[PDB]
Structure formats: structure tokens, C-alpha cells
């Protein structure tokens, strides 16, 4: 499913992401925009053989099991396919574990390079939240 900006903002807010670990909602919407263009079905293969899945492009080497990433730690305890669902619950729950492991949202390259230090508030402007 390809989310609308405000539709995604509302869904993320309902799932407890607004200000989770100090990150305002605009950061999460911005990250999703640049990581998957709001598409829950996005997948991207990496040079190391691992693959990124879903709206937040969660990695198979550490977070989910896709049956093809040798030595994968399945830290979120889920098959990577669950992360492509139109229901973002699995993605949100796993993202919470990721953002809590030490480097915060810096775990998302697109966020660090395209959202960090920008006016992230713009991503939720105009939305009835």
C-alpha cells in the first residue's frame, strides 16, 4: 500500500511513534518518505547480500529473517515479509526496537542524510492529527 503523507502521520501517531525516544512525528514521516516513498512493499538489496524491507526499510541482517541472509540475527523476531503488510504495526514495533539500540534514528541512512537538522515539522503540516 502507498500511504498518503497525512494518512501515514495519523497511523504512526496512533501506534505511538510521536515523540518516541524524543523523535517528533515529523522525523518518522520524513524517514519513511525518503526510505520507501511511503510504499509498504519497498525492498532493496544491499552489497552484503542483506535486504531492506518496508516503509522504514528494515534490514534482514539484524532485524528480520528472510531465509537468505546468512548469520542473520532476527532481533525483531519476525519474517521480513511481515514488514511489507499494508498494516504498519510490525514495522512500527520493530522500528521502536531499532531506535532504542544506541544510535537513535541515525540507524536510517536517509534520515541522517535528508531529515536530520531540517524542519521536519513540515512533514505533518496541514494534517488533522
The catalytically annotated residue of 7, 48, 52, 66 is: 52
Instruction: Give the long-range contacts of residues 104-112, CB within 8 A, separation 24 or more.
Output: 104/21, 104/23, 105/23, 105/27, 105/31, 108/31, 108/35, 108/56, 108/57, 110/31, 110/34, 110/35, 110/57, 111/27, 111/30, 111/31, 111/34, 111/35
The catalytically annotated residue of 7, 18, 35, 87 is: 35
Catalytic residue at 35?
Answer: yes
Range of the domain at 102: 1-129
Burial class (CB in 10 A: 0-12, 13-18, 19+), 94: buried
23: CATH = 1.10.530.10
How many of the other CB atoms lie within 10 Å of CB of 24? 16
Is the distance from CB of 90 to CB of 40 less than 8 angstroms? Answer: no
The total number of structural domains that make up the chain = 1
Catalytic residue at 52?
Answer: yes
At residue 43, the 3 state secondary structure works out as: strand
Where is the binding site for substrate, in residues?
Answer: 101
Where is the binding site, in residues?
Answer: 101
CA distance 95 to 97: 5
Is the distance from CB of 2 to CB of 88 less than 8 angstroms? Answer: no
* Angle, helix 25-36 to helix 5-14, in steps of 10 degrees: 130
- The experimental method behind these coordinates is X-ray
CA distance 15 to 50: 27
Q: How far is CA 118 from CA 31, 54, 90, in A?
A: 12, 24, 27
Q: ∠8-14-16 over CA atoms, to 5°? A: 105
Is the distance from CB of 29 to CB of 55 less than 8 angstroms? Answer: no
Amino acid at each position: 500500500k502507498v500511504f498518503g503523507r497525512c494518512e501515514l502521520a495519523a497511523a504512526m501517531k496512533r501506534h505511538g511513534l510521536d515523540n518516541y525516544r524524543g523523535y517528533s512525528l515529523g522525523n518518522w514521516v520524513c524517514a519513511a518518505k525518503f526510505e520507501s516513498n511511503f510504499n509498504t512493499q519497498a525492498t532493496n538489496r544491499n552489497t552484503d547480500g542483506s535486504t531492506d524491507y518496508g516503509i522504514l526499510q528494515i534490514n534482514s541482517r539484524w532485524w528480520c529473517n528472510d531465509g537468505r541472509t546468512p548469520g542473520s540475527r532476527n532481533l525483531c523476531n519476525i519474517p521480513c515479509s511481515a514488514l511489507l503488510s499494508s498494516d504498519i504495526t510490525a514495522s512500527v514495533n520493530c522500528a521502536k526496537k531499532i531506535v532504542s539500540d544506541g544510535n537513535g534514528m541515525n540507524a536510517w541512512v536517509a534520515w541522517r542524510n535528508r531529515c536530520k537538522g531540517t524542519d521536519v515539522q513540515a512533514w505533518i503540516r496541514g494534517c488533522r492529527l
